Design a protein around this nucleic acid. Structure first.
Ligand SMILES: [K+]
Ligand SMILES: [K+]
Ligand SMILES: [K+]
Ligand SMILES: [Mg+2]
Ligand SMILES: [Mg+2]
Ligand SMILES: [Mg+2]
Ligand SMILES: [Mg+2]
Ligand SMILES: [Mg+2]
Ligand SMILES: [Mg+2]
Ligand SMILES: [Mg+2]
Ligand SMILES: [Mg+2]
Ligand SMILES: [Mg+2]
Ligand SMILES: [Mg+2]
Ligand SMILES: [Mg+2]
Ligand SMILES: [Mg+2]
Ligand SMILES: [Mg+2]
Ligand SMILES: [Mg+2]
Ligand SMILES: [Mg+2]
Ligand SMILES: [Mg+2]
Ligand SMILES: [Mg+2]
Ligand SMILES: [Mg+2]
Ligand SMILES: [Mg+2]
Ligand SMILES: [Mg+2]
Ligand SMILES: [Mg+2]
Ligand SMILES: [Mg+2]
Ligand SMILES: [Mg+2]
Ligand SMILES: [Mg+2]
Ligand SMILES: [Mg+2]
Ligand SMILES: [Mg+2]
Ligand SMILES: [Mg+2]
Ligand SMILES: [Mg+2]
Ligand code: NA
Ligand code: NA
Ligand SMILES: [Zn+2]
Lengths: 66, 104, 238, 33, 137, 51
RNA sequence: CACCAUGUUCAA
RNA sequence: CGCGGGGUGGAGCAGCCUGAGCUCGUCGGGCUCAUAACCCGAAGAUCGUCGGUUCAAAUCCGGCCCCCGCAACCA
RNA sequence: ACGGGAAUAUCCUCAGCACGCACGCGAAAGCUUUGAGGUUACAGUCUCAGGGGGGAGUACG
RNA sequence: CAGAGGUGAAAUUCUUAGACCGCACCAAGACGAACUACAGCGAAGGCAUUCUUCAAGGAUACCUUCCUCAAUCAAGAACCAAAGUGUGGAGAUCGAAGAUGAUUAGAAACCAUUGUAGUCCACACUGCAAACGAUGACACCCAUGAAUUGGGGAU
């Protein structure tokens, strides 16, 4: 259903009005999983910070860097 | 009104040649002389870093020992498109004489 | 777009179940003989599958065709024309060779002369090919000039020597030996070695070879080219 | 813009208006004689 | 069944995927090494309902996933890649769906062979559409 | 003649006549695929032979 | 890169 | 004069085959420094006139006031 | 073998398209052996055009 | 096999009578990418694939020839991009006019799909360009650094 990811870096606020934060997320899976230590760039709505956790659901789309 | 540039915005000295055959702008297709158009040779990666990593993992051919192919393109823009795309920007009058002879 | 088609017809079975698999066989001068597989409709009525298989052109990378060759082979593709169907084996003949687009485009540099030569030659067995050689000028080791453009008379001299060598070397050999020379770069090394004294060259290479005229089909000559033909198990029971 | 004040319509179109006017006048004289 | 060739289990069977990525649509088209026989062809317009989303990376990713499913059905487990833009006298820049489609094929389990750009490039050309003033927008 | 007569000199019917018209009726533009001033290129005339 | 048209006459 | 068609909100036009709509216009409030554009609302008929039939007439049938056409030929 | 060859390196030279660079000049922008310099300390030779803005490159011939 | 095309978004448009896409070809008319440069050639306009040819042209080199034959120019002469004209060809692409679809208060504009004349060639006209270095031709003097094209001299 949804895969948990850990925010390891806040790349910066993106978009007009600065309400969207672009972050680097490491997928949290056990050792040997295909998503183990897989890092993707995501766009986050709401106040977030480093070491926060996200429920990604889909983990294929990667946010365009800004 | 006033002569803005000594070279008149092109690489055609007064006694070098009469006409330079124009080219189509890379973006809009506007015809501009080849010596005037803003020329850029771009070597772009076919994939960004993340996608290239995934494709290289699935590729028996591409990996640490064999690099992925790149795109090679000579792009010539009309002046308007070069400015609008920010390939080139208006500069202070004293900085307009600064020229680069190699890609930095 | 989904759900947008208005006019579908203008008036008002599984596809893969009808397909049989075939192996494509390169000539014996290539280490990997059974490169590539393909499909074709089963022979139905008067439409015999062999009649629609002959003439098909298959493209493969030279490094895949010749294992343990090197990264230089990996930037060339070789095409083959199916000349005869033997069971489920598609025996082929050389069609064309080309350098990949990325490799060829990367060879271009600004402050140098790009010299191109087109050569047409007939082999001993009546095959006619076009050769499309390209060479680049280079600065010398101690050169301080801002460009290494070549004098035009040297460019024409380079073109004539390339044309004479290629015609001399390829006109008295068969197509099989000619392909071996081209794919193993024997002609290429000969060309650059003898053309450098005319003009300092960064690199000379044959970017495209194309067969423009083939002789009348000969079954025996095709079999002599293919030597020992690896068996095809496509028609066998699983 | 690459030119100074025209103090009128674009000179190319003013020239065309004059050109059409000259054509009309020479046609009127032709029908008269 | 599986409609595959008579090969040992796990052996690579190579097709050729032609990815035509324009700024209006993406084509993910799988053929054999000759190009005469086509296994599957899925476009971005078959995955979305809005015209403006036909060239989107998500549409290309969805098209590629269906391509992978049918390729597994047909018995093709590896793909050589031929990438192209519009080319001709038009733009030489690949469309947005180019990268997403190739990545989706790799992440779906499909093996990737040789990759090459086959954008048609004229060595001299006819006149491009638009006037000498270009498109004025 | 089919085009004869009238209080004005005119053909009162279309001048393109069928291929199957009997002699005496087949006058004018016989079995014309098109009429009017040709623009943008003269096509090859005569019967169509795909061979 | 949807669509932004106009501002009465002198004189501060 | 004979034959035919037409009078509907301020304008043009539907419905014209018994139980009023369209666009523009006008009025009120927004947006603008203001006007226009734009947005939200509102009002405006008695179906040319006079009779008849019908439980009911824009509607159906009669006469009238006008408007617009087609014809007014053989000597 | 287009071969007593070919290209570089240092220096010189004549001819050509030019660049950043001293006088001097210019209302200034700028020009500068490539003058717009060598001009009120005004004269090497020839030639074309201009005389406030419009009407107008119009009318007539 | 179900869409394709096109756009800011769409529609005109194409499409199960198989469009778009894929491979190898065939036809025809244009064009000569990257290399392509404050580079070359030409009186200007202009000129870019290769090979084979025909007349030229500048520069350089010379202890060759010659002997003022020169400079600039009313009149006069030849050439002159594009568009335009005439007669034959040709007609792929693009595309004045026109058509359709959008946008808009209106839009017979910009945008989209098209499309005539043209765009190309031969011959003959036209001689209207920001035909610009907005800078007439010939000749003399003139300071500095780094380059560049062609020919010579020295190592
Ligand atoms: K420029
Ligand atoms: K020069
Ligand atoms: K100019
Ligand atoms: Mg200005
Ligand atoms: Mg300019
Ligand atoms: Mg010159
Ligand atoms: Mg010019
Ligand atoms: Mg790998
Ligand atoms: Mg050089
Ligand atoms: Mg301005
Ligand atoms: Mg002025
Ligand atoms: Mg689209
Ligand atoms: Mg579409
Ligand atoms: Mg604009
Ligand atoms: Mg009759
Ligand atoms: Mg008649
Ligand atoms: Mg008449
Ligand atoms: Mg008549
Ligand atoms: Mg005012
Ligand atoms: Mg100077
Ligand atoms: Mg004086
Ligand atoms: Mg005056
Ligand atoms: Mg070329
Ligand atoms: Mg003179
Ligand atoms: Mg012309
Ligand atoms: Mg004629
Ligand atoms: Mg068109
Ligand atoms: Mg003039
Ligand atoms: Mg000059
Ligand atoms: Mg002038
Ligand atoms: Mg030179
Ligand atoms: Na009539
Ligand atoms: Na078909
Ligand atoms: Zn442009």
């Amino acid at each position: 259903q949804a895969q948990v990811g850990l925010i390891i870096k806040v790349l910066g606020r993106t978009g007009s009005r600065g309400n969207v934060t672009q972050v680097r997320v490491r997928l949290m899976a056990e050792a040997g999983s295909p998503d183990y230590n897989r890092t993707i760039v995501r766009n986050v709505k709401g106040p977030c910070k480093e070491n926060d956790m996200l429920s990604l659901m889909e983990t294929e789309r990667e946010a365009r860097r800004l | 009104m006033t002569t803005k540039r000594r070279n008149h915005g092109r690489s055609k000295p007064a006694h070098s040649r009469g006409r330079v055959k124009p080219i189509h702008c890379f973006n809009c297709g506007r015809l501009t002389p080849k010596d005037k158009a803003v020329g850029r040779f771009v070597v772009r990666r076919m994939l960004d870093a993340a996608s290239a990593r995934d494709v290289a993992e699935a590729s028996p051919v591409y990996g640490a020992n064999f690099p992925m192919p790149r795109l090679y393109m000579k792009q010539r823009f009309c002046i308007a498109c070069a400015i609008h795309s920010r390939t080139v920007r208006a500069r202070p009058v004293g900085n307009r004489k600064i020229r680069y002879t190699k890609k930095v | 777009a989904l759900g947008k088609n208005k006019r579908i017809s203008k008036g008002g079975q599984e596809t893969m179940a009808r397909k049989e698999w075939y192996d494509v066989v390169a000539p014996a001068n290539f280490e990997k003989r059974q490169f590539a597989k393909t499909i074709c409709n089963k022979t139905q009525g008067t439409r015999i599958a062999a009649d629609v298989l002959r003439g098909r052109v298959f493209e493969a990378n030279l490094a895949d065709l010749n294992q343990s060759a090197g990264e230089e082979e990996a930037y060339r593709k070789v095409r083959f024309t199916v000349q005869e169907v033997q069971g489920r084996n598609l025996l082929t003949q050389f069609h064309s060779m080309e350098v990949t687009t990325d490799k060829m485009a990367s060879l271009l540099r600004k402050w140098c002369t790009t010299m191109e030569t087109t050569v047409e030659v007939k082999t001993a067995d009546g095959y006619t090919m076009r050769l499309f050689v390209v060479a680049f000028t280079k600065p010398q080791a101690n050169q301080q000039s801002r460009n290494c453009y070549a004098k035009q008379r040297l460019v024409k001299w380079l073109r004539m020597r390339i044309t004479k060598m290629i015609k001399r070397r390829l006109s008295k050999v068969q197509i099989k030996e000619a392909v071996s020379l081209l794919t193993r770069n024997v002609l290429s090394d000969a060309l650059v070695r003898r053309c450098n004294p005319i003009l300092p060259l960064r690199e000379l290479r044959i970017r495209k070879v194309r067969v423009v005229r083939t002789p009348k089909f000969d079954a025996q000559a095709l079999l002599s080219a293919h030597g020992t033909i690896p068996a095809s198990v496509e028609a066998d029971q699983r | 813009g690459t030119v100074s004040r025209p103090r009128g319509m674009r000179p190319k179109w003013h020239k065309k208006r004059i050109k059409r006017l000259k054509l009309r006048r020479r046609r009127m004289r032709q029908r008269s004689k | 069944k599986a409609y595959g060739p008579n090969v040992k289990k796990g052996d690579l069977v190579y097709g050729v995927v032609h990815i035509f990525a324009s700024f209006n649509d993406t084509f993910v088209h799988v053929t054999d090494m000759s190009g005469r026989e086509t296994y599957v062809k899925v476009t971005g317009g078959m995955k979305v309902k809005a015209d403006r989303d036909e060239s989107s990376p998500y549409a290309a990713m969805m098209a590629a996933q269906d391509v992978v499913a049918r390729c597994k059905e047909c018995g093709i487990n590896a793909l050589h890649v031929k990438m192209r833009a519009v080319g001709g006298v038009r733009t030489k820049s690949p469309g947005p769906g180019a990268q997403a489609a190739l990545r989706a094929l790799a992440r779906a389990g499909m093996k990737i062979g040789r990759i090459e750009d086959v954008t048609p490039i004229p060595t001299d050309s006819t006149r491009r559409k638009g006037s000498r003033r270009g498109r004025r927008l | 003649h089919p085009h004869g007569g009238g209080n004005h000199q005119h053909i009162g019917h279309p001048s393109t006549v069928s291929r199957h018209s009997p002699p005496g009726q087949k006058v004018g533009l016989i079995a014309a695929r098109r009429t009017g001033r040709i623009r943008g290129g003269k096509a090859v005339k005569g019967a169509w032979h795909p061979e």
